[PDB]
Design goal:
This is part of a larger assembly, with chains A (about 220 residues), B (about 130 residues), C (about 210 residues) and D (about 450 residues). With about 220 residues, chain A is mainly beta. Helices cover about 5% and strands about 50% of the residues of chain A. Chain A folds into two domains: about 110 residues, Immunoglobulins (Immunoglobulin-like, Sandwich), CATH 2.60.40; about 100 residues, Immunoglobulin-like (Sandwich), CATH 2.60.40. In chain C, about 0% of the residues lie in helices and about 50% in strands. Classes of the chains: A mainly beta (about 220), B mainly alpha (about 130), C mainly beta (about 210), D mainly beta (about 450). The structure holds a molecule of 8 linked components (NAG-NAG-BMA-MAN-MAN-MAN-MAN-MAN), a molecule of 7 linked components (NAG-NAG-BMA-MAN-MAN-MAN-MAN), a molecule of 6 linked components (NAG-NAG-BMA-MAN-MAN-MAN), a molecule of 4 linked components (NAG-NAG-BMA-MAN), a molecule of 3 linked components (NAG-NAG-BMA), a molecule of 2 linked components (NAG-NAG) (7 copies) and 1 more. Chain D: It is a peripheral membrane protein; Single-pass type I membrane protein.
Chain lengths: ~220, ~130, ~210, ~450
């Protein structure tokens, strides 16, 4: 049937800027196109229906245009709360003539560039019960920061290439910041073989190095 | 695809289905009271007549046996003012038809004589060589 | 709206999800739809039903395997058959008018299709090295490791502590098990903090009181 | 260099056009006579991507063709049939008193006459039961009600009048556009367009007040009043659900046969077996209430939503529109539907049994040049149908946008045809066309 193509796949905008997200239909759907906002971990939220009508309780900085085959979601004056993924949705069916909400576009991620904030860096050695399990997870946290950081792990000065998992919270709706959990997982015998565990978090021109010695904790 | 699938695309893309479209000009009456049967008969006649009128024109135009042809007749640009690619690549042929619709009889007379009667005259001269 | 019926099921299984309306009913006419979303991917429409006459519309990949039904004036179902790992997703129900998008959504119910057996989490305290001097600020936490299926719910002090809390997105390891961490920033004057870690698939709820050193 | 216009063929073009429809059917019944050509079980709809098309209800002449096509059939079925003109002999009568339910009193008369044997020189006494509706007093004795109007005829009871779906197909070189949009207004453009060379069958069935066995609205109950401000217009109403109706002719009908000339059987009504009871129809009461609520919600789309809506007892006029009527079970019925309209609507046991009547002399459509006898059918009649819509009218002169009221109305069969045909329009394919090219013709 009708294919809904959404572009760009991701976009960066400074706080206060304008961002335009497009959705193309391969056949005309006149005005029957809706737009949704989705924050990670929430259900989507209706923004615009019938191409340009604003849904209840949606800030005026959201607007929609277009008709037939080409549509545009514009956010005029982007805020940190707008960091989300946006979807268009076809709201008309050519075969049946009915107007139920159906196929979605592929979605557009909007990243919002706010004021730079340097992270606080925390390293957590593995609780004693972890080792008895034969696996040890070392956790490094970079809290409340923008823009993105780099995390490097070292063990007795050797850079770690494997066993590392990173998880980053969604941008904060008030100040655009991130939080990062970086974990290094080793077998208990790797972990006892070595002494110095180091989490280095780099942002721009500054690195912060947090280390511990297995024996001291 | 199927019959009239080209209505969903621009004029250049419509060329792909032209042989499909021609299939239904005489079709559906292939297999078979005054009521109804006289109506059927009228329908049979109508289908035939329309088909023949088109064939007649193509034979005049020398475009017979083809769904695409290349007339030698220039057209007066005033009839439309769009770049050629801007026409062929963005409209249903029907939409375009509505634009051309008030010039069509000009064109048909031109096709008959400005090139075909004239060509035939020249063909005869060649026939005498 | 609230979806129910999700959980962990094996490939080949059938499952029925229910969407329940509260505060309104199908005395008024709506499209009720099911939409799914695999972890990390986009929204995917499944089906809609017009509540006046149960006339239904399906995505091409759903018709023949999923069935939408209006089962009462406040419930719509989605019956699923021959489930595969690729059907793992959050399933949402939503309500729309004619031509006017979907303004009301449920929170979603998570369906996990997997050969693995449910596994409760191991919970480990996260605290700084015992050695370092007493600091004014201190961030403590819980590492929730090795569970299946999602979700876990992590609260602190039985939900009465939420300022200063950061719960990170879970991570699926190579084994197919999940891990997540939650941390809370407090001060040296704070009392010990306790993370409450619920894993409904296994009917487990674990507490772990974390305090520095 | 300058562009040359050149020939193309088979390009799609649509023109609105009218051609005679071609009848076709699945696989004697009056409606098809088995003369319609059988058709292929291949409803190959073609969705037309990226198109829209105007459709105007009440402008399509397919409706008119259907309206006269069925008439021609009706007459065709009756031209073979024997005249009943020997029956204008006056009749002696009495009210039937045998086992009469109290509300049936005077409904039937037993009467007799001196009408001829098939021999030219002989006569015989004849008698039959008759509905009071089919007779009038000869003076202030009775005569058939239509003896002062064009003559009554009837024969060939074997033909069935039960509806059969009828399909219409475009002539070659033509096609039927259709609109699938569940929200479609009776007029204007539709985005849902797709096409067929032919259509699904539509039953010939008629009603004088409520649509029967029509397709259900796709989404919601819908109303198509044309320009609603003109209240002379009939208001179409289409249900999006069926409403079951059951009816009966509880009397155990029996039949008699008469010779009125050589080769001329004449049907007559035998004495009824058992107690006489009124014909009746059962509908869900609860469902009727619910569907009316759906209707008034639809009505309010043209009014403030606190406006008063009312239904009413019929305003009278000719019986054929004053009451609901149908031919189900092969025999005509009429009923007092006014009880269904005894309600009003404001902002913010389980069934009903309607009374009914039977008339054996049928004056079809609006015509007055013909009439025919309906033969008796032995036994109890049972009927089951789905009510699919309403033909309504609105009273003129209302003020302050309130207390609008409605009644059953219309009864022109054309609106019944429209209830289905609004979905389609006929267009003409014009495969010929030209377009500019960079090509110029090749040298001979
Ligand atoms: C049902 O029954 C009713 C009851 O009788 C029938 O009545 C008809 O109702 C329809 C729709 O409600 C009307 O259509 C619209 O009519 C108005 C008025 O048209 C006249 O005014 C013209 C000048 O108008 C401007 O100025 C006046 C004030 O002085 C303002 O009121 C207007 O708003 C305008 O600003 C005048 O030029 C017209 O006469 C000329 O044209 C006619 C040909 O049409 C010639 O015969 C005349 O001689 C003369 O040359 C006329 O007197 C129009 O304003 C409407 O135009 C808009 O809508 C169109 C589609 O709906 C669109 O194509 C137009 O471009 C224009 O759209 C613009 O405006 C809209 C908002 O107003 C926007 O939404 C839009 O996007 C765009 O910006 C329109 O033509 C009928 O006129 C009316 N009947 C009569 C006799 O007046 C009805 O027909 C029945 N319906 C059915 C389905 O059966
Ligand atoms: C809304 O649409 C619906 C759906 O179309 C309509 O509902 C149908 O309406 C028709 C007309 O009212 C009803 O038809 C009548 O049904 C009678 C009963 O049929 C069934 O029972 C009998 C025994 O009683 C069986 O023999 C029949 O078997 C046949 O049908 C099944 C399929 O259902 C097949 O499998 C079988 O092989 C058979 O083919 C049924 O099961 C039926 O008696 C009646 O037919 C008689 O009358 C007609 C003329 O009207 C004659 O042509 C025919 O030959 C029959 O007449 C014989 O019997 C009488 C005595 O009983 C004798 O006097 C005659 O001389 C002759 O010997 C007819 O078909 C149908 O039942 C009904 N459907 C349901 C679900 O109720 C609504 O009408 C419609 N509403 C509107 C307003 O149009
Ligand atoms: C729509 O709904 C309306 C109202 O609900 C129906 O209108 C009524 O129809 C019935 C039957 O068609 C009418 O009754 C008939 O009246 C005649 C004569 O009645 C006169 O004399 C009476 C005493 O004999 C007197 O009571 C009547 O007074 C009423 O009517 C006047 C209006 O004219 C009004 O002012 C009064 O207040 C009363 O309401 C009146 O003056 C009578 O001859 C009929 O009886 C015969 O027929 C019946 C069978 O139908 C039979 O049972 C009897 O034995 C006798 O043979 C009968 O009662 C009634 O008058 C109508 N109402 C009005 C206001 O006119 C209407 O019928 C519905 N529509 C349809 C299509 O049916
Ligand atoms: C079609 O519907 C119309 C209404 O929608 C019907 O109107 C009805 O007409 C009949 C016959 O003319 C009336 O019936 C008679 O009414 C009188 C009086 O009834 C009232 O008073 C008595 C006491 O006198 C009381 O017992 C009843 O409950 C009434 O309150 C009776 O004396 C007669 O026996 C007989 O029933 C109706 O009264 C009248 N309806 C109303 C609401 O007044 C019309 O008759 C219908 N047609 C058919 C053929 O049924
Ligand atoms: C609906 O109508 C529009 C035009 O009226 C059609 O738009 C066309 O859509 C197709 C696919 O969505 C586009 O095709 C792609 O273009 C790129 C650009 O070069 C090409 O490289 C790709 O391979 C692909 O073909 C096309 O650009 C676009 N516009 C046109 C043709 O003008 C649409 O196809 C119609 N839908 C249907 C179902 O007919
Ligand atoms: C049928 O016709 C006969 C005569 O052909 C009628 O009998 C006559 O009735 C009239 C008055 O009723 C008398 O003057 C005659 O004397 C009767 N004829 C005989 C032979 O006695 C009879 O009444 C007619 N039947 C009907 C119902 O009108
Ligand atoms: C057929 O004649 C009858 C009379 O025999 C006409 O009936 C008249 O009908 C009206 C309405 O019911 C009454 O006002 C008259 O008193 C009736 N007349 C009699 C004689 O009862 C009917 O109009 C006649 N039809 C034709 C076409 O003239
Ligand atoms: C019309 O009458 C018939 C029977 O008199 C009703 O049919 C019943 O339908 C229900 C629902 O499926 C069955 O459970 C019953 O067994 C049926 N009855 C019989 C006797 O078979 C029908 O519901 C009636 N319709 C209305 C609107 O009253
Ligand atoms: C229509 O339905 C009514 C009831 O729903 C039927 O009437 C019943 O008739 C029987 C016998 O005639 C009585 O014993 C019942 O008490 C009646 N019911 C009520 C509520 O009064 C009627 O037979 C049905 N008719 C048809 C044709 O289906
Ligand atoms: C109609 O009236 C006629 C006579 O006027 C009745 O005919 C008689 O019927 C009874 C019983 O059926 C028989 O015993 C007699 O022999 C019949 N008489 C003749 C002359 O045939 C007839 O019964 C009446 N029918 C009804 C339904 O009332
Ligand atoms: C109407 O009544 C007649 C007779 O009163 C019924 O005819 C009977 O039919 C059965 C089976 O066909 C026979 O066994 C009986 O002998 C018949 N009766 C007589 C008196 O011959 C007829 O069945 C009734 N109608 C219905 C629908 O039942
Ligand atoms: C009244 O109409 C309804 C709907 O058109 C009929 O119910 C349908 O029955 C057919 C065959 O039994 C099914 O294939 C359809 O799915 C049914 N409709 C729905 C909405 O599910 C019903 O049969 C009709 N009444 C009669 C007496 O035929
Ligand atoms: C074009 O055609 C118009 C009228 O059809 C004529 O007046 C004009 O001279 C023509 N010009 C050219 C350049 O063809
Ligand atoms: C054709 O001519 C009519 C009247 O001369 C005009 O109204 C219409 O706009 C014209 N259309 C085209 C496509 O030439
Ligand atoms: C027949 O019934 C009518 C009214 O229904 C009555 O006027 C007439 O007197 C009755 N005649 C007999 C003989 O019963
Ligand atoms: C049908 O037409 C009416 C009046 O012209 C309009 O209000 C309504 O929105 C139309 N329906 C749709 C589905 O657009
Ligand atoms: C019909 O339904 C309405 C509300 O849906 C209710 O107020 C009314 O009482 C019902 N009718 C009857 C006769 O009970
Ligand atoms: C009628 O009520 C509806 C509430 O469902 C509202 O949206 C609409 O604007 C109202 N219309 C009028 C004319 O008051
Ligand atoms: C409506 O019907 C009720 C009984 O259901 C009756 O009391 C009332 O008189 C009727 N309405 C009118 C206006 O006659």
């Amino acid at each position: 049937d009708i294919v809904m193509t959404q572009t760009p796949a991701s976009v960066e905008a400074a706080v206060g800027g304008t961002v335009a997200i497009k959705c193309q239909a391969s056949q005309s759907i006149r005005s029957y196109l809706a737009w949704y906002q989705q924050k990670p971990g929430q259900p989507p939220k209706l923004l615009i229906y019938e191409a340009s009508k604003l849904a209840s309780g949606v800030p005026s900085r959201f607007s929609g245009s277009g008709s037939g085959t080409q549509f545009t979601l514009t956010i005029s004056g982007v805020e940190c709360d707008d960091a989300a993924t946006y979807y268009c949705q076809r709201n008309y069916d050519s075969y049946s003539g009915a107007y139920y909400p159906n196929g979605f576009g592929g979605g557009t991620e909007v990243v919002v560039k706010g004021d730079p904030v340097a992270p606080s860096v925390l390293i957590f050695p593995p609780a004693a019960d972890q080792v008895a399990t034969g696996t040890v997870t070392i956790v490094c946290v970079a809290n409340k920061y923008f823009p993105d950081v780099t995390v490097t792990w070292e063990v007795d000065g050797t850079t770690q290439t494997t066993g590392i998992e990173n998880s980053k919270t969604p941008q904060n709706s008030a100040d655009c910041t991130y939080n990062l959990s970086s974990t290094l997982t080793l077998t208990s015998t790797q972990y006892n073989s070595h002494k110095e565990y180091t989490c280095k978090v780099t942002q721009g021109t500054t690195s912060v190095v947090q280390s511990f010695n297995r024996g001291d904790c | 695809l199927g019959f009239l699938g080209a209505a969903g695309s621009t004029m250049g893309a419509a060329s792909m289905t032209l042989t499909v479209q021609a299939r239904n000009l005489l079709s559906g009456i292939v297999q078979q009271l005054t009521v109804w049967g006289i109506k059927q008969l009228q329908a049979r006649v109508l289908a035939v007549e329309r088909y023949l009128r088109d064939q007649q024109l193509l034979g005049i135009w020398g475009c017979s046996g083809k769904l695409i042809c290349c007339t030698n007749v220039p057209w007066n640009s005033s009839w439309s003012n769009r770049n050629l690619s801007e026409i062929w690549d963005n409209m249903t042929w029907l939409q375009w038809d509505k634009e051309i619709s008030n010039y069509t009889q000009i064109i048909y007379g031109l096709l008959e004589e400005s090139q075909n009667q004239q060509e035939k005259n020249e063909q005869d001269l060649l026939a005498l060589d | 709206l609230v979806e129910s019926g999700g959980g962990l099921v094996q490939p080949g299984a059938s499952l029925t999800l229910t969407c329940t309306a509260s505060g309104f009913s199908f005395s008024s006419d709506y499209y009720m739809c099911w939409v799914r979303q695999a972890p990390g991917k986009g929204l995917e429409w499944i089906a809609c039903i017009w509540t006046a006459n149960s006339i239904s519309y399906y995505a091409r990949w759903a018709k023949g395997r999923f069935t939408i039904s209006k089962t009462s004036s406040t419930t719509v179902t989605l019956q699923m058959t021959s489930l595969t790992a690729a059907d793992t997703a959050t399933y949402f129900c939503a309500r729309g008018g004619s031509g006017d998008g979907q303004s009301l959504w449920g929170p979603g119910t998570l369906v996990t299709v997997s050969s693995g057996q449910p596994k409760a989490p191991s919970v480990f305290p996260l605290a700084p090295c015992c050695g370092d001097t007493p600091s004014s600020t201190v961030t403590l936490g819980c590492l929730v490791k090795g569970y299946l299926p999602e979700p876990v719910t992590v609260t602190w002090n039985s939900g009465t502590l939420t300022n200063g809390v950061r719960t990170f997105p879970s991570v699926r390891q190579s084994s197919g098990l999940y891990s997540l961490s939650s941390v809370v920033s407090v001060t040296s004057s704070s009392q010990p903090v306790t993370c409450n870690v619920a894993h409904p698939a296994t009917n487990t709820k674990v507490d772990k009181t974390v305090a520095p050193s | 260099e300058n562009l040359w216009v050149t020939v193309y063929y088979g390009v799609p073009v649509w023109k609105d056009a009218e051609t005679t429809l071609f009848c076709a059917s699945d696989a004697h019944n009056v409606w098809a006579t088995h003369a319609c050509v059988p058709t292929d079980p291949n409803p190959q709809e073609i969705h037309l991507e990226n198109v829209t098309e105007e459709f105007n209800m009440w402008k399509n002449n397919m409706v008119e063709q259907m309206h006269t096509d069925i008439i021609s059939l009706w007459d065709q079925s009756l031209k073979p049939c024997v005249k009943l003109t020997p029956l204008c002999v006056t009749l002696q009568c009495t009210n039937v008193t045998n086992n009469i339910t109290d509300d049936m009193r005077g409904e039937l008369k037993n009467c007799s006459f001196n009408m001829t044997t098939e021999l030219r020189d002989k006569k015989q006494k004849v008698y039959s039961l008759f509905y009071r509706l089919d007779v009038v007093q000869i003076n202030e004795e009775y005569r058939l009600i239509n003896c002062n109007t064009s003559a009554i005829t009837q024969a060939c009871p074997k033909v069935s009048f039960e509806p059969i779906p009828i399909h219409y197909c475009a002539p070659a070189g033509f096609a039927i556009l259709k609109c699938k949009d569940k929200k479609f207004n009776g007029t204007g453009p539709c985005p849902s367009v797709s096409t067929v060379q032919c259509t699904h069958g539509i039953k010939p069935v008629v009603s004088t007040q409520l649509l029967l066995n029509g397709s259900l609205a796709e989404e919601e109950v819908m109303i198509r009043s044309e320009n609603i401000t003109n209240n002379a217009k009939n208001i179409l109403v289409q249900f999006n659900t069926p409403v079951q109706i059951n009816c009966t002719r509880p009397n155990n009908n029996t039949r008699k046969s008469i010779r009125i000339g050589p080769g001329q059987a004449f049907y007559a009504t035998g004495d009824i077996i058992g107690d006489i009871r009124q014909a009746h129809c059962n509908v869900s009461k609860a469902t009727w209430n619910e569907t009316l609520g759906k209707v008034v919600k639809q009505l309010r789309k043209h009014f403030g939503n606190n406006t008063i809506i009312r239904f009413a007892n019929s305003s009278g006029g000719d019986l054929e529109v004053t009451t609901h009527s149908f031919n189900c079970g092969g025999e005509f019925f009429y009923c007092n539907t006014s009880g269904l309209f005894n309600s009003t609507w404001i902002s913010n046991n389980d069934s009903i049994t309607l009374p009914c009547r039977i008339k054996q002399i049928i004056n079809m459509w609006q015509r007055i040049g013909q009439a025919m006898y309906a033969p008796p059918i032995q036994g109890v009649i049972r009927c089951v149908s789905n009510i699919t819509g309403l033909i309504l009218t609105r009273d003129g002169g209302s003020t302050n946008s309130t207390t609008e009221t409605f009644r059953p109305g219309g009864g022109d069969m054309r609106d019944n045809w429209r209830s289905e045909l609004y979905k389609y329009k006929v267009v003409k394919i014009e495969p010929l066309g030209v377009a500019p090219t960079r090509c110029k013709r090749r040298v001979v």
